[PDB]
Design a protein around this ligand. Structure first.
Ligand SMILES: Nc1nc2c(ncn2[C@@H]2O[C@H](COP(=O)(O)OP(=O)(O)O)[C@@H](OP(=O)(O)OP(=O)(O)O)[C@H]2O)c(=O)[nH]1
Ligand SMILES: [Cl-]
Ligand SMILES: [Mg+2]
Ligand SMILES: [Mn+2]
Length: 350
């Protein structure tokens, strides 16, 4: 019964009329999946709710989160695509059919073992899904699927992990969805190489207590500094200051390719600043504000901690090929330690 009351808070960024479509979508799904269960014993509705929840975290188009609740209704529910277009419009229908159709299409596809196999399969999804939202929902689906992979046989656990590492994690990268790309990698690594994962995880959880003690000093300090700045706060609706989680798959990938141990690889401390700009009267007003507020923070970060020369990186002005936007700066803090600071808005956070 906890469902929806869990999701609703995450929908705060949507207009009332949009939230209204998402409640209608949830309720419809709730009905379609009535009596259905997951291989976890939970009612099926928990999965599309979790997928919708992921998309709302990613602050997606209303039609996209509604499609998140409806991405599995076209199978064993007695729902025809005509019903979804009739009730939730052609975009929600397009996306749900798109996400459903591809899963089967990948099952048919024969590139298993052939050199550069993933590349030609990734391009297959790219070439067919002109609306990326189809892919985003498929990623949100595979994410939640991997989160609940303990209720699956070790054959499926290894099959899913490899597929995510070959197909979906690189697709998450192409779309500039790093938060997803990271989670997908670390989760795939868990189930694909358990012995290697459990070894690396326990080696980090040995120094983790002391690391986040240090990281929290930086967080608290940078938080208070921003909150005390009157002019930044006037143009701001809210902000989050958080540590960057260790990319265990990226850590281990390097550790094998260029040799070395976890102790041999340098643990560069990082802190992220997510900024929620206050709603501006125009689309231009909001756009200029989005940049303005980020550079405002860069200044405050240098005023707080001594910047290391040449370590300022502007990806707002010059986005990465996959569209990545953020402001990077390496400073000295915590009594002489290098700390990386990533400044971005909520929109930039992917
Ligand atoms: N991880 C997980 N999966 C569960 C669970 N219960 C049922 N499933 C279903 O398993 C499907 C994924 O792997 P399969 O076991 O091969 O199901 P399938 O034969 O239809 O492909 C998922 O549909 P799907 O959305 O199409 O994912 P996928 O088929 O693209 O992999 C998901 O709905 C569970 O508790 N955990
Ligand atoms: Cl991260
Ligand atoms: Mg999946
Ligand atoms: Mn699904």
């Amino acid at each position: 019964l906890g469902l929806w009351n869990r999701l609703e808070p995450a929908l705060a960024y949507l207009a009332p009329e949009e939230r209204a479509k998402v409640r209608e979508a949830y309720r419809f799904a709730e009905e379609a999946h009535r009596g259905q269960l997951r291989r976890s014993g939970e009612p099926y509705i928990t999965h599309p709710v979790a997928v919708a929840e992921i998309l709302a975290g990613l602050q997606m188009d209303a039609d996209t989160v509604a499609a998140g609740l409806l991405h599995d209704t076209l199978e064993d529910c007695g729902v025809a695509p005509e019903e979804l277009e009739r009730r939730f419009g052609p975009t929600v229908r397009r996306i749900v059919e798109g996400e459903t159709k591809v899963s089967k299409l990948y099952k048919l596809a024969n590139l298993e073992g052939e050199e550069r196999r993933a590349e030609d399969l990734r391009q297959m999804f790219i070439a067919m899904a002109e609306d990326v939202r189809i892919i985003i929902v498929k990623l949100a689906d595979r994410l939640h699927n991997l989160r609940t992979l303990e209720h699956m046989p070790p054959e499926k656990q290894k099959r899913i992990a490899q597929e995510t590492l070959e197909i979906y994690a690189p697709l998450a990268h192409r779309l500039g969805m790093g938060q997803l790309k990271w989670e997908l990698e670390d989760l795939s690594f868990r189930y694909l190489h358990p012995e290697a994962f459990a070894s690396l995880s326990a080696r980090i959880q040995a120094t983790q207590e002391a690391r986040e003690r240090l990281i929290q000093k930086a967080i608290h300090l940078l938080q208070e500094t921003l909150a005390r700045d009157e002019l930044l706060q006037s143009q701001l609706q809210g902000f989050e200051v958080t540590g960057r989680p260790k990319h265990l798959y990226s850590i281990w990938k390097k550790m094998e390719r260029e040799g070395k141990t976890l102790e041999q690889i340098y643990d560069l401390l990082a802190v992220r600043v997510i900024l929620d700009p206050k709603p501006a009267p125009t689309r231009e007003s909001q756009a200029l504000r989005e940049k303005q507020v980020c550079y405002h923070v860069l200044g405050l970060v240098h005023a707080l901690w001594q910047p290391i020369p040449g370590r300022v990186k502007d990806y707002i002005a010059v986005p990465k090929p996959n569209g990545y936007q953020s402001l990077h700066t390496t400073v000295i803090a915590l009594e002489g330690l290098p700390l990386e600071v990533q400044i971005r808005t909520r929109e930039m956070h992917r």
